[PDB]
């Protein structure tokens with residue numbers, strides 16, 4: 001389902017310090033970028 005603002009931001013912070021995630025999230029969105037590097041969202 002839909003993420004809260006804080007949930008989305010928690011994913012964004014992790015991806016921001018991974019240049020490869022960061023770039024991937026540009027066009028793939030934060031969720032698939034997150035999960036591609038870090039696995040299924042846990043919450």
Ligand SMILES: [Mg+2]
Pocket residue numbers: 009013
């Ligand atoms: Mg933040």
